[PDB]
Amino acid sequence: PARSVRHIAIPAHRGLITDRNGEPLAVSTPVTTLWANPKELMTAKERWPQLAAALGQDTKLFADRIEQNAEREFIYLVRGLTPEQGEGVIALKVPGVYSIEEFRRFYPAGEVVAHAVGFTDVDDRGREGIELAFDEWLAGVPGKRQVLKDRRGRVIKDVQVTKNAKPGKTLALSIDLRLQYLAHRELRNALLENGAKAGSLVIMDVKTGEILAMTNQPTYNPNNRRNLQPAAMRNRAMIDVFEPGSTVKPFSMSAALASGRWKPSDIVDVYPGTLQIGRYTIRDVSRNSRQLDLTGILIKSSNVGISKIAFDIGAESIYSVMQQVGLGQDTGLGFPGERVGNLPNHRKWPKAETATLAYGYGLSVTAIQLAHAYAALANDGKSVPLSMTRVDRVPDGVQVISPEVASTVQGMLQQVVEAQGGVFRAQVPGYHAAGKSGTARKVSVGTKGYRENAYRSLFAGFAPATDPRIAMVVVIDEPSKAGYFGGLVSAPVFSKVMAGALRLMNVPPDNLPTA
Ligand SMILES: *C(=O)[C@@H](NC(=O)[C@H](N)c1ccc(O)cc1)[C@@H]1N[C@@H](C(=O)O)C(C)(C)S1
């Protein structure tokens, strides 16, 4: 054809992502992509070697590429150069060489918030994290332009633009970059000090359902598009499931207190520190107890104690609490590839499965689910929907644990942290803090039993105890030093991060004299 009217795409500006206070976290940056029409290049061959050198290409390999693409009318030279580098090639004035203005993401906080903010692909589309989850909101709509193409791929004139490029929309996350940096720094330090393989830390606002911080190790710099390490790009807090172990005992206890059959001052006989159930043996770490009260069962973390309570009240009541607080349940966050985990269910619960459920084996949850469950407990038993975006109007929560039961369990968890023989490393000077340690043996990758030397160290809690504001989970995978108990490995991280986060949020210190 002598003339040919066709259409080309004009890239649109991707929406700005900020933290909850407007600090930029993902910013669309103008880049210059160079393309060429090989047929037009065929008329200026003496210019090719200088063009090749400017592109850092070998002269022969470049010439070979153009010659073998002589039939085509569109060939990429280089994508995503800075407009500074792009003009240096444009300045050669080579016939048939053209530029289009595209966009590439810059991430000002880099590795500090990489998992939460996420990453974009070669075409500026979200492929991880918020970038992926809110891709429709962020992407906008590209422009569509008219053209006039010949048999040589030549363009004549303009006088067009049928469709204008629509920019994407701004998005403010629930994340507070101040708390995010604190959490990042403390988790990294903990990983290194313990020679651990991986870790996750989530901070949630118990009143609004907002995720205030979400950090994992290992992490990566999303501005380095060359490294491409899949393991480091995993948002473990949302995609890696684990047995939460003794961190679910406060939920078993909630079921016990709701049953009508148990009060905190009631007693369980846990002597001699083991309990046989068919071919399975329930075992406590500390085996020098006889009568323990319900608070003591949580302080000492007696598997025997919680198991006997579970046999009394029935597994159904415990399953119900865990399901209602969201363990093994869809979070509704809508991140593709987010893992839901699994909460086992039965019509007739056998005794072994009843016991293991009560102390957190045989179910799999994510760190986000665990933090959300603790948020409901801290928020006087009311569960506010999870959000990764800033919440200005809070949706109504669902009452999942009665307020009196939740309050009672809160006081028990304060004792876990403060009482003699408790998790003293979770204490937060100036405040009352509450929570529960866990230590879980990892199930072998093959068939293959439980891995003898591989543990996960957990601490989950909230503060300030007298008026809860923040819930936090710290999960550290395979610590390598002498300590591996959650109370040794994860509790000090909870303490350090809570100390900073409460003060960054201007929460009044509550360890005061009696009124
Ligand atoms: C819950 O997390 C419980 N953990 C275990 O019973 C676990 N199978 C285990 C026992 C012994 C080990 O050396 C390692 C793992 C109890 N709660 C824990 C906690 O951290 O609070 C323990 C006190 C380790 S036991």
Measured in angstroms, the resolution is: 1.6
Pocket of ligand 1 (CB under 6 A): 245-246, 285, 301, 303, 359, 437-441, 455, 485-487
User: Domain 175-221+417-515 has what CATH class?
Assistant: alpha beta
**Chain region(s) in the chain for CATH 3.30.450.330:** 175-221+417-515
Q: Is 426 helix (H, G, I), strand (E, B) or coil?
A: helix
Enumerate the H helices of 125-248 as residue ranges.
129-133, 135-139, 177-194, 236-239
Select from 284, 285, 443 the residue to mutate for testing ligand 1; criterion: most ligand atoms less than 8 Å from CB. 285
Residues 6+ apart with CB under 8 A from 451: 441, 442, 443, 444, 445
Distance CA 43, CA 204 (A): 64
Q: Can you read off the two tokens belonging to residue 346?
A: 């039965």
Distance CA 156, CA 35 (A): 17
Question: Given the DSSP bridges, would you call strands 97-106 and 198-205 parallel, antiparallel or unpaired?
Answer: unpaired
Dist. CA 477 → ligand 1 center (Å): 14
Residue nearest to atom 19 of ligand 1 (CA): 438
Determined by X-ray
Decide: residue 127, CB within 10 A, 0-12 exposed, 13-18 middle, 19+ buried. middle
CA 511 distance to own-chain centroid: 32
CA atoms within 13 A on the CB side of 271: 5
Atom of ligand 1 nearest to the CA of 458: 20
User: Domain 235-416 has what CATH class?
Assistant: alpha beta
Dist. CA 359 → ligand 1 center (Å): 9
Atom of ligand 1 nearest to the CA of 487: 20
DSSP 165: P
Question: Given the DSSP bridges, would you call strands 211-217 and 274-277 parallel, antiparallel or unpaired?
Answer: unpaired
Atom of ligand 1 nearest to the CA of 286: 23
Question: Given the DSSP bridges, would you call strands 211-217 and 198-205 parallel, antiparallel or unpaired?
Answer: antiparallel
At residue 48, φ and ψ (nearest 5 deg) are -55, -45
Dist. CA 438 → ligand 1 center (Å): 6
Distance CA 275, CA 283 (A): 7
442 CB neighbour count, 10 Å cutoff: 16
Distance CA 20, CA 340 (A): 26
396 CB neighbour count, 10 Å cutoff: 8
Distance CA 264, CA 257 (A): 8
Residues in the chain: 515
Annotated catalytic residue within 28, 200, 246, 254: 246
Active site (annotated) includes residue 246: yes
Dist. CA 199 → ligand 1 center (Å): 18
**Chain region(s) in the chain for CATH 3.40.710.10:** 235-416
